[PDB]
Amino acid sequence: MKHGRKIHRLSRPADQRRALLRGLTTQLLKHGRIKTTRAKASAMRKYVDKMITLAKEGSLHKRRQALGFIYEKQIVHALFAEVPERYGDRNGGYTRIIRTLPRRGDNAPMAYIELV
Amino acid sequence: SVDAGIGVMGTKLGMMSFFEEDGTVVPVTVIGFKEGNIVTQVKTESTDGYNAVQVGYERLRDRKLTMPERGHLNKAGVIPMRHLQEFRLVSVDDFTPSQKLLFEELFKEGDMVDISGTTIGKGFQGGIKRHNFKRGLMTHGSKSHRALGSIGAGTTPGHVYKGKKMPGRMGGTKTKIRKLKIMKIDTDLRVVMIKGAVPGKPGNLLRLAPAKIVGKNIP
Amino acid sequence: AVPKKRTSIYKKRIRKNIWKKKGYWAALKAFSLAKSLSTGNS
Amino acid sequence: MIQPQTHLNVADNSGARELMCIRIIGASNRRYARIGDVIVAVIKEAIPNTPLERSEVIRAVVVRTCKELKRDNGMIIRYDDNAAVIIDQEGNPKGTRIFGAIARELRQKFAKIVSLAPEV
Amino acid sequence: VKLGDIMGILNKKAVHAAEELRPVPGIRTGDIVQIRLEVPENKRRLSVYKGIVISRQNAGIHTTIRIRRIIAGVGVEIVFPLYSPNIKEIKVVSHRKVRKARLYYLRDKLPRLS
RNA sequence: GAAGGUCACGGCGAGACGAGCCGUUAUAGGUGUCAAGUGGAAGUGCAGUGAUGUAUGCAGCUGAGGCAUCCUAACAGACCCACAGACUUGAAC
RNA sequence: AUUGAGAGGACCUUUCCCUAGUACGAGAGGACCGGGAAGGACGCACCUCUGGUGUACCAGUUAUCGUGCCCACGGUAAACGCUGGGUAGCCAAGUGCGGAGCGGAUAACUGCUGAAAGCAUCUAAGUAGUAAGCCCACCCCAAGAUGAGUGCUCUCCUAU
RNA sequence: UCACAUCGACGGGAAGGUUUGGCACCUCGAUGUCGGCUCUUCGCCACCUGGGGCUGUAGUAUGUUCCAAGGGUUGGGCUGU
RNA sequence: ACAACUCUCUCUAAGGAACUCGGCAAAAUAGCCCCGUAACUUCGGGAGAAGGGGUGCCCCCUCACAAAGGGGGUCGAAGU
């Protein structure tokens, strides 16, 4: 009965869950700050952090590993060039969750996610 | 109620396959300990109406406790702790407060121990899983599958009987598993190795006290 | 399936007032957040 | 894990080719019989000219099973077949030869079976 | 000693004790093993066993291996506790070149395998 | 603003919601690592006309589990509550 | 932190072995009493072992589309494209545990002492054995037990 | 051999409300008819399990009947049954 | 959010109709090529009867067999 089961569903099937996390991850990486729900945000910390971690070891292999993910070549080339300079010190936890006011037309709880 | 020795608090730490020099493979629960099992209060026929000993367990920073509990433990002159549990005995003396309970010296192996503890919580669950009901047919057009079927009889009883078995919250409750072999007492590590299974996942408190057979208690 | 009579009065008041108390709880919580909005939060 | 209506190969040369189980014997209200247990079976086919004809209710004892019996050692033992041996009544099987392989657990109650076995 | 790490440490002793009785070689899937054990039938008669390792359930002290062999006529599949006292001699005889962690398919292929 | 309680904040082997329990500078996440799973990546070398094999390599990818470390979020803070306890008799310094 | 009025769950049964081939019986057969044995059903708990699942994870492979092209990945083939594995969790076919008392009062029954009725009589006085049945005991709940119990400890300043 | 171990003719007297009836008292501005599944509970006039008396009871295994309703009272073939 | 329960689905150790009014429902079979095909018959059928074997990928013989046919290799537990 969900004992020791840890996975953020996002109300969806696995079709669309990975589709969400992927696209959200892309847009977040692109813009640098996004407004979304608390759950859509709080689930997203495994994948942004995984991809920044993936951008430490900039090698043929790891770029393809990341490039299967993002579905936008020119964002993932921004990383690898960017990351090791502006995150070289920081050891994990590259992501901040600020939290701001429910959405109007459904009392949906709301948040900001952006790079730290 | 009246327990056959003084018990000892403890913590579950998973299961081990324990061998012996025969080659008998035995399943076993590793039980660890945390600061104390220190005696706290002693109750008497004199003042309190019965004979009993209260025993704390598990050390804390003394901000996480409340004033009253701080007082109750600081009266005994004892480390900050949660989980004061009693042990009602017939025997009363030689349990004066601020006295540590040596689990090593107070059991002595091959004992058969009675372990209580709160079980795994399975939430609100159906008639099948809860009370070992049977389910109806799957095909031959049965619109009943998993259910209680009928509850009661008819107009004569004219109501549902008290304690009629129904869907409800199964688990998260105390159950004494009694008579369990002590396989090994690791002097080094302060870790008791008990044959078989024990209520709850790794973490739970356990009230570890000796066999409570009817040639040991009160005729 | 179907109701035998109507609850009619007084009982329906008792039922509605708890629902309005849900509203009360929300009001308390929203009042609490306004002080949090004033000063700090980093 | 042999139960009512299970088809069971024969591991000796009493003549019967294949059995079918119809009851467990010993320990009543038993769901199914694992290795060691005695069952009742109808013979579903035999070699033509043998004594044990087809369609006869007879006792057998289960020796090969697809459902791992366990030692206290910790070793477990599957087979690839469910097969029993046609017991006579109390003691030996009818044939004077047993095939396949069989476990040590059998030798307490059925001494004569592990006497005749090839690879115990 | 940390209470979380006890069940690690308790394994660390229990394996490394048993391995100092007898050093176990690097067996894994698709290896022809011969394995003899001091059977307690009130007789140290030494019943050997042989066949392929079709699996390797790694799990500390009760780490174990599933040996398949076509015995006399029938197929048989004995799993062994890898660090038993009862077990005496493990020997790796040969190595088939499989490429799968468990070989449960080998159950229902042919008798000419093993 | 007493003791304490309730909210909020991060959670849970607790849980339909409430409830319960833990945490609020080792609670969850991340990162590091290690059990464990899976089965030998990519790139390149070499072999073969080629499908493919083969070495670098118990690899690579996972890691719901354990352990380590404040890198991120536990900020900001709110609400409730106090007459030392009506009244009568009888023992007691 | 407990006390327990009260209220529930559980007190089930099988052959085998010793007693003993003894008592009994011409033989054939074969005990009473008590003590050991491994099961069956049943319940309580667990995941070390054996596994199921495990759309989280890993591996192969069809079709086609996308990543400019080869390489290598991604999408889709309802709410796994199809297979082959599987940690945690949850599960049993798996693992542990359980049923115990020389405690009480009884039911049928067997009695002792003993008249009415010089004898007899288990009863009218008294009293002893004596059942999976009844009550305590085991296990869980429990002072909303308004009859609201008992213990230990903390707190009673002011606009706060 | 002996009515009364075990049966008990001709006859007599009871209880129970499970069968087949008699009556037509509630219900025709509707109270769904058998058997099966699921889930109960209760009664004793006891199938087994506990404890007994008698036996035409040597023992084993019965027969009979007293106490006892705590527990249990399989899986199939055929038939809607 | 990830309780019971219902539905639309996916899998399932050992057994394999023991289910049930009844194998209802589910499962299994399946494309192509080659071999092979019984009782009976209105001589047209039965008949795709039944039952078997081969299929992926690469490389070759042929003055004409829609990745043919045949020969040889190579990968997977598995090639419609």
UniProtKB/Swiss-Prot annotation, chain A:
InterPro entries: Ribosomal_bL17, Ribosomal_bL17_sf. Keywords: Chloroplast, Plastid, Ribonucleoprotein, Ribosomal protein, RNA-binding, rRNA-binding, Transit peptide. SUPFAM superfamilies: Prokaryotic ribosomal protein L17. GO terms for cellular component: chloroplast; cytosolic large ribosomal subunit. The keyword Chloroplast applies. Component of the chloroplast ribosome (chloro-ribosome), a dedicated translation machinery responsible for the synthesis of chloroplast genome-encoded proteins, including proteins of the transcription and translation machinery and components of the photosynthetic apparatus. Component of the chloroplast large ribosomal subunit (LSU). Mature 70S chloroplast ribosomes of higher plants consist of a small (30S) and a large (50S) subunit. The 30S small subunit contains 1 molecule of ribosomal RNA (16S rRNA) and 24 different proteins. The 50S large subunit contains 3 rRNA molecules (23S, 5S and 4.5S rRNA) and 33 different proteins. NCBIfam families: L17. This is Large ribosomal subunit protein bL17c. It comes from Spinacia oleracea. The lineage of its organism: Eukaryota, Viridiplantae, Streptophyta, Embryophyta, Tracheophyta.
UniProtKB/Swiss-Prot annotation, chain B:
Transmembrane segments: none annotated. The keyword rRNA-binding applies. One of its GO terms (cellular component) is ribonucleoprotein complex. Keywords: Chloroplast, Plastid, Ribonucleoprotein, Ribosomal protein, RNA-binding, rRNA-binding, Transit peptide. It is found in: Plastid, Chloroplast. Its main location: plastid. Residues 144-172 are annotated as: Disordered. It comes from the Eukaryota. One of its GO terms (molecular function) is rRNA binding. Belongs to the universal ribosomal protein uL3 family. This is Large ribosomal subunit protein uL3c. It comes from Spinacia oleracea. The chain holds residues 85 to 303 of 305 of the full protein.
From Swiss-Prot, chain C:
GO terms for cellular component: chloroplast; large ribosomal subunit. Its main location: plastid. Keywords: Chloroplast, Plastid, Ribonucleoprotein, Ribosomal protein. It is found in: Plastid, Chloroplast. One of its GO terms (biological process) is translation. GO terms for molecular function: structural constituent of ribosome. The keyword Ribosomal protein applies. Belongs to the bacterial ribosomal protein bL32 family. Component of the chloroplast large ribosomal subunit (LSU). Mature 70S chloroplast ribosomes of higher plants consist of a small (30S) and a large (50S) subunit. The 30S small subunit contains 1 molecule of ribosomal RNA (16S rRNA) and 24 different proteins. The 50S large subunit contains 3 rRNA molecules (23S, 5S and 4.5S rRNA) and 33 different proteins. Component of the chloroplast ribosome (chloro-ribosome), a dedicated translation machinery responsible for the synthesis of chloroplast genome-encoded proteins, including proteins of the transcription and translation machinery and components of the photosynthetic apparatus. This is Large ribosomal subunit protein bL32c. It comes from Spinacia oleracea (Spinach). The chain holds residues 2 to 43 of 57 of the full protein.
UniProtKB/Swiss-Prot annotation, chain E:
Coiled coil: none annotated. Transmembrane segments: none annotated. Disulfide bonds: none annotated. It is found in: Plastid, Chloroplast. It comes from the Eukaryota. Component of the chloroplast ribosome (chloro-ribosome), a dedicated translation machinery responsible for the synthesis of chloroplast genome-encoded proteins, including proteins of the transcription and translation machinery and components of the photosynthetic apparatus. Component of the chloroplast large ribosomal subunit (LSU). Mature 70S chloroplast ribosomes of higher plants consist of a small (30S) and a large (50S) subunit. The 30S small subunit contains 1 molecule of ribosomal RNA (16S rRNA) and 24 different proteins. The 50S large subunit contains 3 rRNA molecules (23S, 5S and 4.5S rRNA) and 33 different proteins. Belongs to the bacterial ribosomal protein bL19 family. This is Large ribosomal subunit protein bL19c. It comes from Spinacia oleracea. The gene is RPL19. The chain holds residues 117 to 230 of 233 of the full protein.
